[PDB]
Each structure stands twice: as C-alpha cells, then as structure tokens.
Amino acid sequence: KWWYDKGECGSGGGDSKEKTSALSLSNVAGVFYILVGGLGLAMLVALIE
Amino acid sequence: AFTFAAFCYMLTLVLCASLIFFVIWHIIAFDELRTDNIERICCLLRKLVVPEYSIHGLFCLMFLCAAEWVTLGLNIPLLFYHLWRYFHRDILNYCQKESWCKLAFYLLSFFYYLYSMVYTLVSF
Amino acid sequence: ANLAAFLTVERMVSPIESAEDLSKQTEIAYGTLDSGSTKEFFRRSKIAV
Amino acid sequence: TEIAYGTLEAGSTKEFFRRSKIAVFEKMWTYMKSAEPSVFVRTTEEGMIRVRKSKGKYAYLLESTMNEYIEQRKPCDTMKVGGNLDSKGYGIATPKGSALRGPVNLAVLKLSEQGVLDKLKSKWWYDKGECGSKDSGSKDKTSALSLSNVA
Amino acid sequence: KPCDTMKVGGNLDSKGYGIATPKGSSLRNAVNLAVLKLNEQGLLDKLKN
Amino acid sequence: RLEIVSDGKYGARDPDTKAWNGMVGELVYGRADVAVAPLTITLVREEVIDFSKPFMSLGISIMIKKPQKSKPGVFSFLDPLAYEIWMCIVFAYIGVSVVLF
Amino acid sequence: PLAYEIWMCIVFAYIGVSVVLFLVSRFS
Ligand SMILES: O=c1[nH]c2cc(C(F)(F)F)c(N3CCOCC3)cc2n(CP(=O)(O)O)c1=O
Ligand SMILES: CCCCCCCCCCCCCC
Ligand SMILES: CCCCCCCCCC
Ligand SMILES: CCCCCCCC
Numbered sequence: 128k129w130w131y132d133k134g135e136c137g138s139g140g141g142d143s144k145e146k147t148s149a150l151s152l153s154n155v156a157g158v159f160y161i162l163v164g165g166l167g168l169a170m171l172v173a174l175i176e
Numbered sequence: 177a178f179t180f181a182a183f184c185y186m187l188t189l190v191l192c193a194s195l196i197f198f199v200i201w202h203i204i205a206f207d208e209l210r211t212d213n214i215e216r217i218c219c220l221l222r223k224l225v226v227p228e229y230s231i232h233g234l235f236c237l238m239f240l241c242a243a244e245w246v247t248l249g250l251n252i253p254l255l256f257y258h259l260w261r262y263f264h265r266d267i268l269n270y271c272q273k274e275s276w277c278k279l280a281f282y283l284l285s286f287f288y289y290l291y292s293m294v295y296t297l298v299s300f
Numbered sequence: 301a302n303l304a305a306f307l308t309v310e311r312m313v314s315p316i317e318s319a320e321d322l323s324k325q326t327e328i329a330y331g332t333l334d335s336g337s338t339k340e341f342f343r344r345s346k347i348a349v
Numbered sequence: 350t351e352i353a354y355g356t357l358e359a360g361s362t363k364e365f366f367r368r369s370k371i372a373v374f375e376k377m378w379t380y381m382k383s384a385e386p387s388v389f390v391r392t393t394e395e396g397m398i399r400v401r402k403s404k405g406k407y408a409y410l411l412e413s414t415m416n417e418y419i420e421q422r423k424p425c426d427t428m429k430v431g432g433n434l435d436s437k438g439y440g441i442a443t444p445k446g447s448a449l450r451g452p453v454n455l456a457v458l459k460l461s462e463q464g465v466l467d468k469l470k471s472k473w474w475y476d477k478g479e480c481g482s483k484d485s486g487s488k489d490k491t492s493a494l495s496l497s498n499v500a
Numbered sequence: 501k502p503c504d505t506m507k508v509g510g511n512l513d514s515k516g517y518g519i520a521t522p523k524g525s526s527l528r529n530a531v532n533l534a535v536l537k538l539n540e541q542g543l544l545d546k547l548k549n
Numbered sequence: 550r551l552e553i554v555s556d557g558k559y560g561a562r563d564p565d566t567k568a569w570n571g572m573v574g575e576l577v578y579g580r581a582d583v584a585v586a587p588l589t590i591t592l593v594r595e596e597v598i599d600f601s602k603p604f605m606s607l608g609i610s611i612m613i614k615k616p617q618k619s620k621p622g623v624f625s626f627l628d629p630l631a632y633e634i635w636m637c638i639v640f641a642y643i644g645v646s647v648v649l650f
Numbered sequence: 651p652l653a654y655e656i657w658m659c660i661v662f663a664y665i666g667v668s669v670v671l672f673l674v675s676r677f678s
Contacts, residue, residue: 133379149628180496180659190666227673238662302494313489314508344463347467352613370546371546397612400612405613408611413608426615429611429612433608433609437590440588441586441588442594442599443582458602470605495621497623498621499626500625514606533592
C-alpha cells in the first residue's frame with residue numbers, strides 16, 4: 128500500500144506503450160552513403176579504364 | 177468521397193478527349209474529299225472508326241458496374257447508332273451531317289464528366 | 301502489408317450487439333423459456349421491438 | 350495512465366470513491382487525489398466541455414442517466430462506454446407516517462410492470478435527442494483496406 | 501466452464517430482487533435500513549465479485 | 550398541484566444544525582406531501598423519510614470523447630517513408646541517371 | 651486484404667491504361 132500502490136507510474140499500465148513509428152532518413156542514410164560511394168567508385172574505374 | 181462511380185467518371189475525361197480527336201479528324205477527311213489516293217483517305221477512315229466505337233463501348237460498360245444508370249441513358253442511343261453502321265456496312269452531304277453531330281454530342285457529354293465527378297468528390 | 305497484418309493479430313467481432321439489432325436482421329433464430337417471466341413479459345409488450 | 354479521469358468537485362461520486370474499500374476503486378482514488386492538472390470540476394457542464402476539448406484525454410465519471418442524456422440530447426461528440434460501476438436507484442418519497450405510501454408504491458410497481466417507464470425513458474432520451482440516431486445500424490469495422498487509403 | 505458462451509447487449513427490463521418480509525411483522529423497518537446500509541457500504545458489490 | 554422547490558437542491562442533514570434541506574426538508578416539516586423527482590435512495594434519507602420502489606436504476610458510468618471517423622488523407626500511402634526520404638530518392642534518382650549517362 | 655471496391659477499380663484502371671497506351675502508340 129505504501130510503496131507500490133502510492134506510485135507515480137504503473138507497470139501493468141505501460142506494458143506495451145506501442146506507437147506508430149514513421150521511418151525517416153535517420154536510419155536509412157546507411158544505404159544512401161553506399162549508393163553515392165558506389166557511384167564514385169564506378170566513375171573512378173570508368174576513368175581508369 | 178471516393179466511390180467506384182467517381183473513379184469511372186475520372187477515366188472518362190481522359191478517354192473522351194481522345195474520342196474528340198477522332199471526330200475532328202473525320203471532318204478533316206471529309207473536307208479533303210470535298211475539295212477534290214482516294215482509297216488512302218477512305219481506308220484511313222476505316223481504321224479510325226473501329227477504335228472510336230470500341231472506346232465508347234467501355235463508357236457503356238464502366239457505368240454499368242458503377243450503378244450510375246442516370247448517365248448510361250445518355251450513352252445508349254449513341255451505341256445504338258453504331259449498330260446501324262455494322263448492320264449495313266449524296267453520301268458526302270449525308271456523312272457531313274452525320275459527323276458534325278458527333279463533335280457536339282461528344283463535347284456536351286464531356287462537360288458532364290467534368291461536373292458530375294465534382295458532384296461526388298467534394299460532396300464527402 | 302494488409303495480408304501480413306491480417307494473419308498477425310485477429311479481431312473477431314460478435315455478429316450482434318443488442319436486441320433491437322437482431323429483430324431487424326432476423327437471421328439468427330432466438331428462443332426463450334416456455335412459461336415464466338420472459339414469456340409473460342414478451343407477451344404483453346407495448347413497445348414495437 | 351494516458352487518460353486522466355476526474356469527477357465532480359463536491360458530489361456523491363467523490364464521497365463514494367473516498368469510502369470505497371475495493372482494490373479496483375482504491376487505486377483510482379489515490380490517482381485522482383494527487384494530480385497536477387484539474388481532476389475535479391465544480392459544474393457538470395464545465396467538465397462536459399472539458400471532455401469535448403480534451404479529445405480523448407479526460408474521462409468524466411458521472412451517473413448513467415445523466416451520461417445517456419448528455420450523449421443523445423446534446424451534440425453527440427462523446428459517448429458512454431462500459432457498464433455501471435456501482436448500483437443506485439431513484440425513488441419518489443412520502444412524509445414519515447403518511448397514508449400516501451401504500452397506494453403510491455403499488456402504482457409505481459404497476460407502471461414499471463406494464464412497460465410504461467421503459468416507454469417514457471425511450472421517448473425522452475432517444476426519441477427527442479439533439480443529434481438523433483444517425484445510422485442506427487452500427488457499421489461493423491471493415492477489416493479490409495478502404496479505397497481512400499490508396500486514393 | 502467451458503465458457504463457450506458469452507453475454508451480449510444491455511439489459512432490456514430492470515427488475516429487482518427484494519428481501520421478503522411478512523405483512524404484520526415489524527421486521528420491514530429494520531431489514532430495509534439494513535439492506536440500504538449494506539448497499540451504501542459497497543458490501544453487496546464485493547460479495548457479488 | 551406541481552411546484553418547484555425554492556432552494557433548487559435535494560439537500561441532506563446539515564452538519565451544524567439537524568435540519569433537512571431541499572425537497573426532503575419540506576417533506577419532513579410538512580410543507581409537501583409528494584416529492585416526485587430524481588432522488589437517489591440513501592441511508593440518511595430513508596432513515597427519516599419514506600421511499601417507494603425504485604422506478605429507475607442507474608450507476609456511476611464513464612464518459613469519453615467519441616472517436617471520429619478519422620478520414621485518412623489523400624496521400625496516406627506516403628506515411629511509411631518520411632518526406633525527406635521521398636525527396637532524397639528523387640534527387641538520388643536523377644543523380645544516378647546523369648552519372649550513368 | 652483489398653476491399654471489393656478496389657478490385658473493381660484495378661481492372662478498369664488496367665484496361666484504361668492499356669487503351670491509353672494503345673491510343674498513344676497510334677498517333678505516331
Ligand atoms: O439526491 C441526489 N440526486 C441527484 C440527482 C442527480 C441528477 F438527477 F442526475 F441530476 C445528480 N447529478 C448526476 C451527476 O452530477 C450532476 C447531477 C446528483 C444527485 N445527487 C448528488 P449531488 O447533486 O451532489 O447532491 C444527489 O445527492
Ligand atoms: C487543345 C486543342 C487545340 C486544337 C487546335 C486546333 C488548331 C487548328 C488549326 C488549323 C485549322 C484549319 C481549319 C480548316
Ligand atoms: C511527400 C511529398 C513528396 C512525395 C514524393 C513521391 C515520389 C515518388 C517517386 C520517388
Ligand atoms: C513536391 C514534390 C513533387 C514531385 C513531382 C514528381 C517528381 C518526379
């Protein structure tokens with residue numbers, strides 16, 4: 128009663144707390160760096176050839 | 177809103193505009209023969225009439241599945257005239273009068289899809 | 301995406317929600333007691349439903 | 350805990366929660382007793398517009414009859430969900446030791462048995478609502494994808 | 501068990517289960533107050549739960 | 550003859566003086582004979598006043614804001630990818646094409 | 651996964667795109 132009942136938060140309440148996560152460039156930039164790196168490498172071997 | 181009949185009225189605007197060019201090219205073909213080889217202008221007319229009649233067949237088919245029977249009645253008499261062309265398969269003055277009405281009919285009904293579509297989209 | 305969302309979680313809804321709704325569909329044959337309070341109440345009922 | 354629920358400032362609901370020795374209602378009382386925002390409204394109408402303005406953030410706790418009337422006989426932007434927590438009952442009174450208690454009690458039971466009180470309730474609560482019953486047949490939640498989502 | 505069924509829809513008619521008392525008996529003036537006290541104390545709800 | 554109580558409240562036993570307020574007060578003091586009105590049946594009232602059988606049942610209910618239809622936007626299919634992703638794809642599309650040429 | 655109103659919209663959009671492409675490949 129004095130420790131768990133008089134608490135600010137609840138364990139059973141905020142169990143899932145799932146929210147719709149809209150993807151952004153913060154985690155997709157990994158493929159954009161390789162994309163530009165591939166273009167730079169392709170232009171380099173083209174000039175060497 | 178967004179209904180199947182509202183989308184059918186949207187495809188008509190893109191397709192009926194192509195039917196306008198056909199009836200206009202027919203008047204140009206009739207005007208060339210009136211001024212005056214000859215088989216070229218007539219054979220090209222036979223190749224143009226087939227798509228014009230088949231495209232209108234979709235207009236009577238799209239609205240049939242769209243439950244918009246108030247618009248189908250404005251296109252059934254147009255399809256009935258195509259049956260007379262296929263059943264029988266001077267003539268210059270007759271074909272001229274039989275082509276000017278096509279440009280006026282394909283245009284007055286064209287403005288319907290430009291307005292009947294708005295009567296459903298913004299009416300959400 | 302929708303087919304993956306279907307097989308992941310299921311949401312089965314009841315075919316009915318009240319008595320005034322099943323009286324209009326008339327697709328589910330509902331029965332009561334032979335002689336008792338329910339039969340006597342449904343016998344002398346002034347409401348239309 | 351995402352939605353804060355409150356009741357009347359001074360009413361029978363606050364007195365009931367203060368003396369409710371139930372674990373389901375005890376945790377609710379300690380939550381409503383300590384809260385930074387306003388979890389107690391003086392006027393029932395001020396709490397009603399607070400629910401309409403919160404848009405899914407304030408769950409007002411009121412009686413069943415007042416909740417059904419404020420949902421039907423008013424612009425229905427809010428609805429009633431769930432069953433009754435406790436059980437109460439109205440009733441007409443009579444001075445202590447009066448000859449107008451017997452026949453009056455028999456008349457109340459007679460009206461409630463002949464289906465008259467149910468008719469009067471359905472007439473004043475549903476047959477005269479503000480927004481009425483638009484689409485009385487509850488539209489089932491279509492699991493399929495709508496057309497506007499890919500419009 | 502086996503909990504294969506469930507309850508749907510609200511109550512159509514609402515009647516009450518009253519504690520009987522003989523007519524000439526003087527126990528009504530006590531049992532009424534006792535039932536009201538037990539209802540106000542929230543004991544009937546806990547007993548039902 | 551029907552008349553409305555002047556106090557406009559139901560009233561209970563006052564804590565200072567043992568006097569009933571509102572409709573229940575006018576009944577005990579003989580000012581009224583019948584009080585037909587929404588009156589919750591309680592212990593303190595029945596102990597001094599007579600009650601009839603409950604003509605209406607009720608209970609503490611919950612009232613929440615009715616969720617609207619929430620009509621999705623016209624471009625709702627562009628939600629899984631942010632606006633920054635869609636533009637960066639187009640700029641990477643033209644960039645790859647010019648490099649390929 | 652797709653409502654019956656979308657399946658009817660896909661078929662007519664398919665034939666519509668087809669006839670539009672045929673008309674475009676005709677003026678040339
Ligand atoms: O005997 C009583 N009869 C009551 C009747 C009503 C109603 F009929 F529903 F209006 C109400 N409301 C329900 C919700 O809050 C607003 C009005 C409260 C009542 N109270 C509690 P109080 O008003 O705080 O004294 C009584 O004690
Ligand atoms: C969008 C449609 C534009 C149509 C323009 C037509 C111009 C015709 C010029 C030649 C007319 C010859 C008449 C004998
Ligand atoms: C969100 C506004 C911009 C949408 C651009 C969509 C581009 C699709 C093809 C890459
Ligand atoms: C605001 C973005 C417009 C994109 C138009 C289409 C580009 C391929």
